[PDB]
């Protein structure tokens, strides 16, 4: 009773070239309270040193944050982002997609 549904976007910083190092972004926005849990996943498994940006909010009081980690895409590996905010019954997982 102090929340608002979050928006998520998974995407590389640079256009995806397999074998070539890139960076994977998880842009989570539109949530509140500022309290949120974020995991980047590689083949269904939690990636370690995932960096978070500093907390910020928009003119509508909602908060947004960018979770990112270096990664090198490969025809087979699958990445995704998982978010668990108190404004959601269940956590949300959204898979990356080199075409988006």
């Amino acid at each position: 009773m102090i929340q608002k549904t979050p928006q998520i976007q998974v995407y590389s910083r640079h256009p995806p070239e397999n074998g070539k190092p890139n960076i994977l972004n998880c842009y989570v926005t539109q949530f509140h309270p500022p309290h949120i849990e974020i995991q980047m996943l590689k083949n269904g498994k939690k990636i370690p040193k995932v960096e978070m940006s500093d907390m910020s909010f928009s003119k509508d009081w909602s908060f947004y944050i960018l979770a990112h980690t270096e990664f090198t895409p490969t025809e087979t590996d699958t990445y995704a982002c998982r978010v668990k905010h108190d404004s959601m019954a269940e956590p949300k997982t959204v898979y990356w997609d080199r075409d988006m």
Partner: protein, 273 residues
């Protein structure tokens, strides 16, 4: 339409830790300063290169201002549990936005001062910088306390004074920086997405500021049908990204053309697949 804002947040969480206080300042929507009660050495820090021009006296003082803001938020946060008769079990958020807009004549165009509790509008200084707008029973109490205290009148000072005196000053030191840009880099990607239809996605990358428009036009008549877009998002390096797609009949992809409108461009981008 230059502007300056200071976003302040204080969140109280279940535990022994006193609530956390964060403050972020902006100049033309660009972050230039920040303060986090969670930092090892709490102090406001430069966030834009053009701020390094300020000397210690600027930071010592502002950090002392943050310290106070913190107790203020802390105490206020406490008073809210009261007005709302909330159980001392859990977490809450108290946000503030203030600052001032500067007209062409370097004159104060408008001032802002509003707070939100639990992400909802609480109390807010009206454009006349004289009266208040409370949002519910609780805020009525705050409103009165302030009308009686003569608070509006002291925020007005800041908005009309200090907020202006410095904003211009900041712009002065950081005009070159603030004024810079990064045009977009664009290209289209092909995509199966059907047995007769294909998806064209026009990409725009590495541009700054975030403002941008992307069109799809088939011989003249721009398209809006079957056209997808995405919230502009950060690349994580300062710039932004965005794309738009359109469903197109096979073996026709090359007929449709995409254009990219941005202020960085000396002319709008025009490309096809």
């Amino acid at each position: 339409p230059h502007s300056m804002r200071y976003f302040e947040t204080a969140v109280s969480r279940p535990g022994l830790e006193e609530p956390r206080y964060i403050s972020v300042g902006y100049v033309d929507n660009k972050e230039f300063v920040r303060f986090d009660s969670d930092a090892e050495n709490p102090r406001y820090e430069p966030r834009a290169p053009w701020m390094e021009q300020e000397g210690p006296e600027y930071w010592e003082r502002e950090t002392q201002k943050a310290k106070g803001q913190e107790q203020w938020f802390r105490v206020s946060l406490r008073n809210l549990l009261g007005y709302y008769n909330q159980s001392a079990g859990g977490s809450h958020t108290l946000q503030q936005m203030s600052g001032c807009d500067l007209g062409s004549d370097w004159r104060l165009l408008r001032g802002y001062l509003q707070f939100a509790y639990e992400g909802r509008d609480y109390i807010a200084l009206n454009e006349d910088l004289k009266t208040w707008t409370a949002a519910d029973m609780a805020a009525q109490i705050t409103r009165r306390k302030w009308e009686q205290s003569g608070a509006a009148e002291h925020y007005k000072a800041y908005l009309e004074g200090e907020c202006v005196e410095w904003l211009h000053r900041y712009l002065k030191n950081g005009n070159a920086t603030l004024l810079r840009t990064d045009s977009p880099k664009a290209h289209v990607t092909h995509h199966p997405r059907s047995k007769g239809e294909v998806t064209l996605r026009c990409w725009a990358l590495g541009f700054y500021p975030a403002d941008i428009t992307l069109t799809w036009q088939l011989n003249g008549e721009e398209l809006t049908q079957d056209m997808e877009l995405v919230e502009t998002r950060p690349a994580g390096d300062g710039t932004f990204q965005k794309w738009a797609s359109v469903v197109v009949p096979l073996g026709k992809e090359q007929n449709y053309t995409c254009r990219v409108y941005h202020e960085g461009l000396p002319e709008p981008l025009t490309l096809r697949w």
